[PDB]
Design a protein around this ligand. Structure first.
Ligand code: A1H69
Ligand code: ZN
Length: 258
């Protein structure tokens, strides 16, 4: 029906409502590290998050998201494979029922426990609705999560998830600094792809960082207590909200590093 991640509405059904699901530049993909070409012409990623203004945290029935003020150039991505300036709209995660799955991208078929997406849109298109209709409209910065040591910068997020358990719930989430979610290295892979949920628009320049962040078992367990369902409905844990790897087709994954 309305799409989700279950047996009857999950990724293998999405093509019926969104035929671009079987398109030529779908995401995510497996990153085959030995086949990705080092591109010495790729520039360092420019991440400018000092003036970020977070606004709200929301359970959208498919993930939770932290939304930012994107009405000015306060939190922007540029350089790397990008032409121009991309404003941060929101970040969200994909995660598993257990630590051995949850990421959308894979690395030599390895699945991480979770994947963080920082979603940015190209200011030349003026708004994100316009940007998703363009092949260079969005840049999504993808960061893998493994389970081990706690990520201190994630704790303010984990501590409010009890307040947005079910679909539709939101809360004030001001003064959150997304720099606390970044790994040391900005070494990346890049390829042209898509949104990984409906409507699966082929509008994304993917930038996937090589270095995962570590989060604790206690932090990821709080993700797994969220609910896909709305408040009065049968409880269906929000887990395994990831789309599997899609055919690479006529695409090259480029590495910023040797
Ligand atoms: C159709 C439309 O209006 C677009 C504009 C911004 C898009 C959203 C941007 C933020 C994330 C990106 C996300 O893609 S991902 N997982 O590759 O980062 C798909 C869901 C969602 C909510 C997107 C859904 C479709 C949206 C609402
Ligand atoms: Zn995502």
């Amino acid at each position: 029906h309305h799409w989700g991640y279950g047996k009857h509405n999950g990724p293998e059904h999405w093509h019926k409502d969104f035929p671009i699901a079987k398109g030529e530049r779908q995401s995510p993909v497996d990153i085959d590290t030995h086949t990705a070409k080092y591109d010495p012409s790729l520039k360092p990623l420019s991440v400018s998050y000092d003036q970020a203004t977070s606004l709200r945290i929301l359970n959208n029935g498919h993930s939770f998201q932290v939304t930012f003020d994107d009405s000015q150039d306060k939190a922007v991505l540029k350089g790397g494979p990008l032409d121009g300036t991309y404003r941060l709209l929101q970040f969200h995660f994909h995660w598993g029922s257990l630590d051995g799955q949850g990421s959308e991208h894979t690395v030599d078929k390895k699945k991480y426990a979770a994947e963080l997406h920082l979603v940015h849109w190209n200011t030349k298109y003026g708004d994100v609705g316009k940007a998703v209709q363009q092949p260079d409209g969005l840049a999504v910065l993808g960061i893998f999560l493994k389970v081990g040591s706690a990520k201190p910068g994630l704790q303010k997020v984990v501590d409010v998830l009890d307040s947005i358990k079910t679909e539709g719930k939101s809360a004030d989430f001001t003064n959150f600094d997304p720099r606390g979610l970044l790994p040391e290295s900005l070494d990346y892979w890049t390829y042209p792809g898509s949104l990984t949920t409906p409507p699966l628009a082929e509008c994304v320049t993917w930038i996937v960082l090589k270095e995962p962040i570590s989060v604790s078992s206690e932090q990821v367990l709080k993700f797994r207590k969220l609910n896909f369902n709305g408040e009065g409905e049968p409880e269906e844990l929000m887990v395994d909200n990831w789309r599997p790897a899609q055919p690479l087709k006529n695409r090259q994954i480029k590495a910023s590093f040797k």
